[PDB]
Symmetry: D2
Subunit: 119 residues, 4 copies
């Protein structure tokens, strides 16, 4: 893969991610997040440190089969088999900035870490 | 154009830029760089501040019709109709880090400024 | 050689100087921090506005405010040798902007080459 | 802290991290990294997913009290209380690109994840 092809793959991963969150698509999220990955951020004053399972469970609870999510890729950085992404996304009526670290492992990009902040 | 489509359009822009530079393709470079765009950096300790015409003339002078040039996209950032790009590329036997700012105008991403350093 | 941390501190100072000089309509400060051939480019009122340093300094004078404490934030800073690119959020004349600045370390100091912006 | 102070705190964090790794300074590393933080990357063809403790242990094992580390900050990005840093750093005769995700929690910036690649 060229960096351009990797950037297209990373763009596709973001689209998969935002739609899977909105729809509560557990298999889709498990294919793009490592099992050891965490979702970390402040929510209602508390520091939340969610496992992949917990993160997905929250998406499933808040799932909506009709809403079209609103999102944008604000930044993508790539160095060899690692990448950084800044995604702007709406979820449960709030606007978030997601900072995602990703690793190309055995042919596909998987999220290692997700940190977010609510605007 | 969607958020994904702008990222793809910006990566296409980089490919066009690197190949047009290598090949000394004036038509392509004039389509992707605004007329008042500048290419700025140091060369042999001297500040080179090139107009688009000057920059393109240098590409024409050094043009290579056959080589497959090395290049990579290190980062792409977008806020509405503006973008920032970090591109690594080879030109005339030197390796460069290029920082480019771009504006989406009348449906086309066109480069406003290019600053570079020679490694 | 000077470290990347030291350069980032200098760029941070440059951004503060830039935002305050713009807000205050400080012509000497703006002429110091922007190269003579620098450009300010973006869409304004639906049209492409390509401003020379003389044009945008006159615009800063026009909208000058002697006392307002302007909002600004550095969203990103990237540095490679003697070049830098910065994403700055700032308020000016009642509007919020995202500015993408290209900067060059020249003769011992960081100086702005160009600024592209979009109004939120 | 002000916007300038936050940027300063983040570059200071990088300085602390790189020196602490070189010296095998466990107290420093435990202060700057969350306990649940992970260090992830490919190392000699395999995926290495280290806990903070496992990462600190390797630093201690390779500790050197005299070497002046070679490093550079390539980028710093901030959105509210989250940040991402791209740091170039030399360790054990190899050059790395480190992508760090950081969170401002209770007044200090601490590392949530460190993803890397070896050049």
């Amino acid at each position: 893969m060229t960096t351009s092809e990797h950037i297209a793959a990373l763009t596709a991963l973001v689209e998969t991610y935002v739609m899977a969150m909105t729809r509560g698509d557990r298999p889709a999220l498990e294919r793009i997040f490592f099992g050891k990955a965490s979702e970390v951020g402040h929510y209602e004053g508390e520091l939340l440190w969610n496992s992949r399972d917990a993160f997905i469970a929250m998406c499933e609870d808040a799932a909506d089969a009709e809403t079209d999510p609103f999102w944008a890729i604000s930044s993508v950085s790539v160095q060899g088999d690692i990448a950084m992404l800044h995604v702007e996304n709406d979820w449960a009526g709030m606007r978030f900035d997601d900072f995602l670290t990703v690793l190309l492992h055995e042919g596909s990009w998987r999220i290692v870490s997700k940190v977010y902040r609510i605007r």
